[PDB]
Amino acid sequence: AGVASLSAAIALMSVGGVAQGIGSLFAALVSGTARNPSIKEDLFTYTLIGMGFLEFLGIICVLMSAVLLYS
Amino acid sequence: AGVASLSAAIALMSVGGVAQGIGSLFAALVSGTARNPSIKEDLFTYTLIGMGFLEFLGIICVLMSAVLLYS
Amino acid sequence: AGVASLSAAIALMSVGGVAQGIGSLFAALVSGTARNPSIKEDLFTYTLIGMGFLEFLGIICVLMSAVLLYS
Amino acid sequence: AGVASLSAAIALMSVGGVAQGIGSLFAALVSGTARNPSIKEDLFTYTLIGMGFLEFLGIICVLMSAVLLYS
Amino acid sequence: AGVASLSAAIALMSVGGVAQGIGSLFAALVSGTARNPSIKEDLFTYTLIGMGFLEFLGIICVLMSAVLLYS
Amino acid sequence: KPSWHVAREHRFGPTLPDHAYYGEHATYNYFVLFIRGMRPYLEKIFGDCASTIKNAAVAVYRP
Amino acid sequence: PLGVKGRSVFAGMRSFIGQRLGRLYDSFYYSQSSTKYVMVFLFPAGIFYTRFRADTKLGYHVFINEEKLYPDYSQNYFDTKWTNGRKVYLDDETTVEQLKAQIYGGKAAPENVKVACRGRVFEDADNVAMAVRAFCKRDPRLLLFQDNL
Amino acid sequence: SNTVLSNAWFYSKTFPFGAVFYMLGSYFYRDIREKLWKEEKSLIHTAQENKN
Amino acid sequence: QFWEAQFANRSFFFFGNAWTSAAAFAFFIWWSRVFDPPPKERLDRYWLNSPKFRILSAFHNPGKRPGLKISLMTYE
Amino acid sequence: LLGHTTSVTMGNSDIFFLPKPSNLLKIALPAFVFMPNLTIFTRAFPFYAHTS
Amino acid sequence: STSPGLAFANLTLLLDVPQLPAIWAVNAWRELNGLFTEMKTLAGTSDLLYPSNRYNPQNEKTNRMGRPRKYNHGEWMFGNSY
Amino acid sequence: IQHWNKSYEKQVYSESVALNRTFQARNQLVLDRLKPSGAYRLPAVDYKRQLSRGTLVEGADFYLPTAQEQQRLARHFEPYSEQEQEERRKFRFQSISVYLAVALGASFVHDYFYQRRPVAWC
Amino acid sequence: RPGQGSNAQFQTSLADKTRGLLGVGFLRPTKMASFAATFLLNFRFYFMYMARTTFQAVRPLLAFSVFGEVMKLVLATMSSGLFSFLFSFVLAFEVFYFFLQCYISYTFLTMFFTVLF
Amino acid sequence: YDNTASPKSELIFMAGNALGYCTERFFENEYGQSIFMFALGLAYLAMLGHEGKIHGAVWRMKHLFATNFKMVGHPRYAYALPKNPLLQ
Amino acid sequence: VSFSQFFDSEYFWTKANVGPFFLFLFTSPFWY
Amino acid sequence: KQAWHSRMGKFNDRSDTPMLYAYMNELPSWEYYDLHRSAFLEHMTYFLV
């Protein structure tokens, strides 16, 4: 009976790894800013590109959840 | 009718990754601050932005869980 | 509904990622206090902010658990 | 009386998830004492605070295990 | 030969995390010794303090495992 | 956080003074000054009450 | 020098109250419009209403036996559906007919509907307060059912 | 005429706490006293020097 | 001392962390009702099932068994 | 004696006395804060009470 | 000012000191209702009024529990049946 | 694009004109009539303005009300009058007798008047 | 006059002065609702703080009571001399652990009951 | 029967109901008398610590002031002292 | 002593004995 | 004195850990002019002239 809900919940589990990746990204960002502020503006660009992948995958995940909670 | 509760729990079993990411965030904040205090305002400025994503993911990680508890 | 009793446990499993995160955070705090001690007043503050998030997340991981144990 | 035992065993995962984090905290204390032996106190206070946090999480999950084992 | 054995076995999944924490503890002790041997008696002390939690937690889990094997 | 642009809601200047926001003096504050001023009347009151009670109790206890 | 001759302690009280009221007016004027009106009028008013109603009136938890007997609340807003256990505050003069009409929204109720409390059927020409006092003292949980029998 | 000295409370709290206090006092008898008397000694020295 | 503490700063009646503040807090909770005894309407909530109550009843009824009188007090 | 049995009352037995030897002590001791200070920042108390 | 250890007192104050006006108003309303009831009693009643009771529906045609009086259709030599 | 963003700014400031007109009207109607006098103004000045004025004092969480008590450390010869000295000599120690008496009285009252509870009778 | 040049510019419409009387862009009921919402949502901090406080208050009680019960179970169950000899050291460890927890609770309580003003 | 909802406005009685529960369960009984004694013990310990602080302060004042020959009073009030006839 | 000259501020705060008055004021609820 | 100043600063200042800075929609003069430096200049040239 709870097929769709269970599958959606099992799909939603990768958000943990996504958040871990984002945390590693921004940790490296703040570390590189502490180690060389003069290139801060550059580092953030690459960090955003990282988000441009990570969040994108996360979005795909949530879309699949929305697909599977309603079949 | 506990399958809905099971789905909500499974969807709620991903906040650990968000928490690990937030811990890494604030760890890098503290490290880069001890390395260079004068630039704290930037490390924080990016830190909040990271939270601005991570907390949002966590919010989803709650919201969908609640939905799976009722629908 | 025994699975209710299961669901609560699952909602508590995220604590395994939570405590880890907290540990990492305080580890960095200690490293900072071992590197630039004269700015403890900063680092502890930032650590408290981080806990102000992490605590809340953990509390959710408790609350929803208990809810799934009763409802 | 079979689902309660499994619920407690599944809830016991956060103990192992929490032992990691205490390990990292005390490792950071050790490394800080190795990098600056002149500051032993003001590192053990933060170490004990983080231990208290992770101990609170451990107590939470163990309490809920004992609860679900008989309720 | 039923659910009690399954629960007492599932309780043992935390020993991996406890072992990882102990490994982190003693790896930090080894690193601190190789860095500054002249505070060995300090580091060893702190290591024992850490074990005074970690080991105890493991023992807890083992006991609860037997409690789920003979509940 | 300071900036050269002014938003819409903040377009029309300050409407509030500083004391509307800032906390009073920590050691010379309104209540403590008030009670230091009211000390004599309260001393009168409680001394009169205590003396009345003590005199009554003594008038009972002596005989 | 405490006190002045020709002046009364009541006059001094009036002085002080005037000072306090003027200061309150000044502090309310020089305050944020976003917060002060709420914190000074809407939370006090709601708290007053709630506490007075609870401490003064007397209320009842209402249940219905069957879903077919539930009222129609589709049209009225903020409550699209009946839920059992609703707390309902009434006056001491309320009767069972008035309660039934209040439940069913002044609309045609079902047939042979009656009220019970702890298994004990109420007459329809009965004061709800006294019927509860008699039949279910300090357990006002009422139930609406169909009496075909 | 009681079970006080044969109690789980006895064996769990009274004997462990007492034996630990005794062992610690025996092992750190002089460190503690010196650390306590440091201030009094310094004060007496200062007073005597000022007097002189 | 208490009187002077009242006019010292951060030393008013029950505010602060001084011993005067603790004593005033104690007097305040005493003056409150929460530690007063219950009324007769509320005795069978806790008091008639209390170890102190039972022991005192047994003590002041030396050779008797007050279970029945306790039941009747509950009824009352 | 139906309604006269809840009127047989007995008093408590606690004595509030303890000698307070301060000559033994020379150090201060910690103390709890029991209530928030409303004599200062009274107007802002609902607005800052939730912070730390 | 404040602290986490004072969360109990902060919550209690915030939630209870606004209710004190309502509590005093309830007490005043109760006192006034008692005054009006006692004035009515002094004026006079057919059947008695219980002062400390919630509701007093009793009259010539109504019991002290809100029901109609039994055997109240005729008249009685000793007057009221109560 | 130029056209459109220019006209956007144009009616941005149109709305600003409307806001300013209603602002003037609100003020000169309501607030100039409801303005406080200034008699009951706040009887203090903010610590920042005092610090800029060179006026702020931080110290003395406590005070000494009477000049007899203020000038004690400056007199150096009579910090206390003779009468005051003999009155102070009465409080060299705390009174355990009075402590005992008051504590026993308060315990008796609190126990046998304020903390009475019912007991069963057989 | 000095300010007549400026006060000549301040002439309003009927609709202007009605809008000002009502306070359209200066009351902001949406801002009032947002303030009320944020203020009510800020009540979670009290729950967090009381949770932390009660944990720090009961930590010594737990260390003294439940591990005590476990040790008491072991004492009730053990009979021989070797196991008892080995268990004495566990008891001493529990003593040290209790004192450690008491120190930690002291620390957290002086942190949670320290007020600036 | 136990699904007795109640209006969401009555959440303001959360703390009141909590304090009433803890009063009926703990405070108005023997455990409440123990709690009152506990509060009195807190007062006792605060007073003891205050007096101990004063004891330590005076115990240091003795040693550091009574044998100086330079502190006839406090230096902040030396303006009020008489003047030395030997200085010139 | 008259009501007026009793409740005059100078006599009230200097020469009068307000102990009984303020005790009656404190115990007003008891009397009511 | 330093404790006094640090306490008052921590309490009143606009920071990342704000105690008193909260529910801010209408700002006072000092904070307004500290955040909007354009208006301090305009409001100041007008006052002098």
Author numbering:
A (entry chain I1), B (entry chain H1), C (entry chain Q1), D (entry chain P1), E (entry chain O1): 96 to 166
F (entry chain D7): 42 to 104
G (entry chain O7): 9 to 157
H (entry chain B7): 263 to 314
I (entry chain J7): 78 to 153
J (entry chain W7): 54 to 105
K (entry chain X7): 2 to 83
L (entry chain C7): 32 to 153
List passages from the publication reporting this PDB structure.
F-type ATP synthases are energy-converting membrane protein complexes that synthesize adenosine triphosphate (ATP) from ADP and inorganic phosphate. In mitochondria, F1Fo ATP synthase resides in the crista membrane where it is known to form dimers, which can further assemble into rows critical for inducing the membrane curvature and maintaining membrane potential and morphology. Here, we investigate the mechanism for the generation of the unique cristae in the Apicomplexa, using a combination of single-particle cryo-EM, cryo-ET and subtomogram averaging.
A large-scale preparation of T. gondii tachyzoite mitochondria and subsequent mild solubilisation with digitonin resulted in the isolation of intact ATP synthase complexes, which we identified as native hexamers. Masked refinement of the hexamer membrane region resulted in a 4.8-Å resolution map. The C2 symmetry axis through the dimer is tilted 22° with respect to the C3 axis in the hexamer, thereby bringing into proximity the lumenal regions, which extend 80 Å from the membrane. The hexamer model shows that each of the three dimer-dimer interfaces contributes ~1211 Å2 to hexamer contacts. In the first site, three copies of the subunit ATPTG9 are arranged around the C3-symmetry axis, directly beneath the central lipid bilayer. In the second site, located at the periphery of the lumenal region, ATPTG11 establishes a network of five interacting subunits. A helix hairpin of ATPTG11, containing a central cysteine pair, extends parallel to the membrane plane and mediates interactions between the dimers.
